Amino acid sequence: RLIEASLYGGISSAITRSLRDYLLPENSGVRKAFQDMEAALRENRITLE
Amino acid sequence: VERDEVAAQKRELEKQIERLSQPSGAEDSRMIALAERFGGVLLSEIYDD
Amino acid sequence: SSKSVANIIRKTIQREQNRIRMLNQGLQAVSFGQVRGVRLNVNVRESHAI
Numbered sequence: 734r735l736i737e738a739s740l741y742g743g744i745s746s747a748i749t750r751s752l753r754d755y756l757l758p759e760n761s762g763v764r765k766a767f768q769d770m771e772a773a774l775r776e777n778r779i780t781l782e
Numbered sequence: 783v784e785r786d787e788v789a790a791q792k793r794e795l796e797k798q799i800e801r802l803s804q805p806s807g808a809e810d811s812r813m814i815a816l817a818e819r820f821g822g823v824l825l826s827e828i829y830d831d
Numbered sequence: 832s833s834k835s836v837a838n839i840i841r842k843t844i845q846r847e848q849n850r851i852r853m854l855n856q857g858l859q860a861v862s863f864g865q866v867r868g869v870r871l872n873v874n875v876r877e878s879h880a881i
Contacts, residue, residue, distance in 0.1 A: 763843065
């Protein structure tokens with residue numbers, strides 16, 4: 734998308750729609766703590782099912 | 783006996799994984815609160831990048 | 832729990848805002864016809880701010 738938008742020129746519609754998806758990096762720190770803390774419950778629930 | 787020994791290895795592996803989890807993997811049990819209770823920042827977090 | 836999560840979220844938001852602000856300065860005073868500057872405007876949604 735980046736390359737071809739540059740090739741034809743103009744304000745790309747697709748880039749404009751998903752602006753946050755392109756310009757912001759995804760951060761794992763906020764998440765993995767809670768995945769590990771959540772683990773004991775997840776396993777228990779799956780076992781019960 | 784084989785079951786229990788493998789269980790011991792699995793417990794060690796989870797504990798090792800858990801130490802590397804969050805927020806910037808460290809002795810997180812108390813260190814996060816200790817980091818904010820003084821006007822400071824965790825060194826390992828400064829060297830995250 | 833609680834406050835510490837809020838602080839990590841706030842610091843992440845602050846760092847992203849600052850980096851964007853740095854990128855933003857390189858684009859000042861670019862002349863394209865009648866356009867004279869470009870910016871990436873970053874804001875925080877209310878429903879999440881509260």
